[PDB]
Design an enzyme around this catalytic site. Structure first.
Site, PDB file in Angstrom:
ATOM      1  N   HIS B  41       0.852  -1.335  -0.502  1.00  0.00           N
ATOM      2  CA  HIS B  41       0.031   0.507   0.058  1.00  0.00           C
ATOM      3  C   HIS B  41       1.362   1.061   0.034  1.00  0.00           C
ATOM      4  O   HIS B  41       0.326   2.726   0.042  1.00  0.00           O
ATOM      5  CB  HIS B  41      -1.051  -0.023   1.016  1.00  0.00           C
ATOM      6  CG  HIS B  41      -0.703   0.821   2.465  1.00  0.00           C
ATOM      7  ND1 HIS B  41      -0.653  -0.625   3.200  1.00  0.00           N
ATOM      8  CD2 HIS B  41       0.743   1.206   2.958  1.00  0.00           C
ATOM      9  CE1 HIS B  41      -0.297  -0.600   5.013  1.00  0.00           C
ATOM     10  NE2 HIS B  41       0.413   1.146   4.110  1.00  0.00           N
ATOM     11  N   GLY B 143       1.857   6.019   9.456  1.00  0.00           N
ATOM     12  CA  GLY B 143       3.653   6.266   8.982  1.00  0.00           C
ATOM     13  C   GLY B 143       4.248   5.665   9.246  1.00  0.00           C
ATOM     14  O   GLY B 143       5.690   5.044   8.933  1.00  0.00           O
ATOM     15  N   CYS B 145       3.062   1.877   9.195  1.00  0.00           N
ATOM     16  CA  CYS B 145       3.539   0.665   8.386  1.00  0.00           C
ATOM     17  C   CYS B 145       4.391   0.058   7.941  1.00  0.00           C
ATOM     18  O   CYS B 145       5.704   1.503   7.804  1.00  0.00           O
ATOM     19  CB  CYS B 145       2.215   1.074   7.032  1.00  0.00           C
ATOM     20  SG  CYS B 145       2.117   2.797   7.015  1.00  0.00           S
TER      21      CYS B 145
HETATM   22  C1  LIG Z   1       0.859   3.548   7.950  1.00  0.00           C
HETATM   23  C2  LIG Z   1       0.166   2.830   8.212  1.00  0.00           C
HETATM   24  O1  LIG Z   1       0.761   1.521   8.820  1.00  0.00           O
HETATM   25  N1  LIG Z   1      -1.662   2.559   8.200  1.00  0.00           N
HETATM   26  C3  LIG Z   1      -2.103   2.398   9.855  1.00  0.00           C
HETATM   27  C4  LIG Z   1      -1.541   3.510  10.657  1.00  0.00           C
HETATM   28  C5  LIG Z   1      -1.735   2.848  11.882  1.00  0.00           C
HETATM   29  N2  LIG Z   1      -2.057   4.132  12.816  1.00  0.00           N
HETATM   30  O2  LIG Z   1      -1.889   1.775  12.189  1.00  0.00           O
HETATM   31  C6  LIG Z   1      -1.746   2.949   7.076  1.00  0.00           C
HETATM   32  C7  LIG Z   1      -1.817   1.631   6.008  1.00  0.00           C
HETATM   33  C8  LIG Z   1      -2.930   2.053   5.535  1.00  0.00           C
HETATM   34  S1  LIG Z   1      -4.211   2.678   7.238  1.00  0.00           S
HETATM   35  O3  LIG Z   1      -5.895   2.657   6.153  1.00  0.00           O
HETATM   36  O4  LIG Z   1      -5.024   1.786   7.985  1.00  0.00           O
HETATM   37  C9  LIG Z   1      -3.680   3.815   7.360  1.00  0.00           C
END
Ligand SMILES: *CC(=O)N(CCC(N)=O)[C@H]1CCS(=O)(=O)C1
Ligand SMILES: *CC(=O)N(CCC(N)=O)[C@H]1CCS(=O)(=O)C1
EC number: 3.4.19.12
Lengths: 304, 304
Positions: B41, B143, B145
């Protein structure tokens, strides 16, 4: 989202850990630049620990009696000296992995990470708080002495603790990196009882703010209080008195959540008086006090 | 003595963290040898996340669209490919800090450390458990991820998790290093409810053994039970069923303490039925389930 008891990344400290042996005693040392810092009780046998005269024991020791090993290679000791309860072993090689560092003497209530080591090797990392009675509730077995506590600000490691002792109650005592013990503790195997382990009120409030930010809000009430009224309750429950300095430090959390510090104190007062009633806050069934207001801001904003 | 939620020393993993940017999205990558692993992603905008066609989005991407930065220096991308939900970016330079490593797909109930990172930089380390519903209760902001979960055996890092998603309930979902999600979760911003978060019974028992070793013994009773009787109680309290495999894994702890596994199950049964009555076990007011029997043995013996 989510809130965890997070420790600093330990890599910068891992690169400083060495094994120090003197006679038959082996513990951990901290190698920064061309000096290895370790507890002075490396010169003691367990029998000496009962009533040690460190100056007299140290006279019988020469540079070649301190064996310092970093990984699988031996460091040459070219000088030694005792500074309070630590030994400083001058080596002929600067540690190439020396990070930017400072030695800091923390106040009770302040938190830090501990890199538990045995034989100069890291076993694990965890987050601690210096208790108001100057003990730490760590996880240390024999040979863990010389393991250190630290905080990191971007690239600077501030070393604040070096492990020395386990009190007969199973709590831990140690020094700052100048070798001065936190609290009244001494490096002697004798009766050393700790004082009252009070709760770090400013930290509990900070953790309640962290709970609100992360969605746990059941404990918010319709009440407010005053610093003097709150402190009458805090004294009853062995909580540290809250000062205007603590209210000021909670200002950014108060501003972010829109909950005035004294309103949060009133929620805390009700939680003290009524208990959690089988409920949890951030996955805990007790009021957590090992997160400072700085830790909450850092974790809730992702400071690297 | 003392028992703490300890994480593995994170240095070996810190040396693998990089920042990956594609278009306007930035997350973390794991650089091992000449490959950078990151969530697929990274090719999505927040709008794409609603209903992404990863194969179609990836066609519009070339090697030069993936910006990989390790510290302050840029890595040259010479190949890219999608393996399940991860991207593998081939770089022209092997990571000199690559530790000995393995990719492992853990089972629910297993624990691991997470090195939370932002912009390729480590912010903190904490110990997690893969929940029986295949979520993790982490601490991850936007951020984060691409941050990874791992275990370490002497010098070998076994990477088991890569962070991808936050469910609408605030719990976390991700993949193993082959890009296969744990559980039924998908890398799409849609309704993904988690199943029942049951308690990891074998872990609670292991933590009760850790408590006995460390001096907390008030909960030991005069009773015993059978696996079938215990399991009737476990089902009632949303605890995982205990099997003979779990009893076998608790064998060394049972032998060290002299408390038969079924006797410890009977203490656990009474703690479930009567509660803690305002008491604590290892500083916790609830039954802790994020320590495996292996973690308890490791911590209680000082494995480095
Ligand atoms: C960058 C990431 O890990 N996201 C989640 C952020 C948190 N709070 O874990 C990002 C990946 C897709 S998502 O819609 O969950 C937002
Ligand atoms: C090596 C060390 O730190 N000791 C304590 C071990 C624990 N469990 O903390 C060692 C120093 C003097 S002592 O009598 O406390 C034993």
């Amino acid at each position: 989202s989510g809130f965890r008891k997070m420790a600093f990344p330990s890599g910068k400290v891992e690169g400083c850990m060495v094994q120090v042996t003197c006679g038959t005693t082996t513990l951990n040392g901290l190698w920064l630049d061309d000096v290895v810092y370790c507890p002075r009780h490396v010169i003691c046998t367990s029998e000496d620990m009962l009533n040690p005269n460190y100056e007299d024991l140290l006279i019988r020791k020469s540079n070649h009696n301190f064996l310092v090993q970093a990984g699988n290679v031996q460091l040459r000791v070219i000088g030694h000296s005792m500074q309070n309860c630590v030994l400083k072993l001058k080596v002929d090689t600067a540690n190439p992995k020396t990070p930017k560092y400072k030695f800091v003497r923390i106040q009770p209530g302040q938190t830090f990470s501990v890199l538990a080591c045995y034989n100069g090797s890291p076993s694990g990392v965890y987050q601690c708080a210096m208790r108001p009675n100057f003990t730490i509730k760590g996880s240390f077995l024999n040979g863990s002495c010389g393991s250190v506590g630290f905080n990191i600000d971007y690239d600077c490691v501030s070393f604040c603790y070096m492990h020395h002792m386990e009190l007969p109650t199973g709590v831990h005592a140690g020094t700052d990196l100048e070798g001065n013990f936190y609290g009244p503790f001494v490096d002697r195997q004798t009766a050393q009882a700790a004082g009252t382990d009070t709760t770090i009120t400013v930290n509990v409030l900070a953790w309640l703010y962290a709970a609100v930010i992360n969605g746990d809000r059941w404990f918010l009430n319709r009440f407010t209080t005053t610093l003097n009224d709150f402190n009458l309750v805090a004294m009853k429950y062995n909580y540290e008195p809250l000062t205007q300095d603590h209210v000021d430090i909670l200002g950014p959390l108060s501003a972010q959540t829109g909950i005035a510090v004294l309103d949060m104190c009133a929620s805390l007062k009700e939680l003290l008086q009524n208990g959690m009633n089988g409920r949890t806050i951030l996955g805990s069934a007790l009021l957590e006090d090992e997160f400072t207001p700085f830790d909450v801001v850092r974790q809730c904003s992702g400071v690297t």
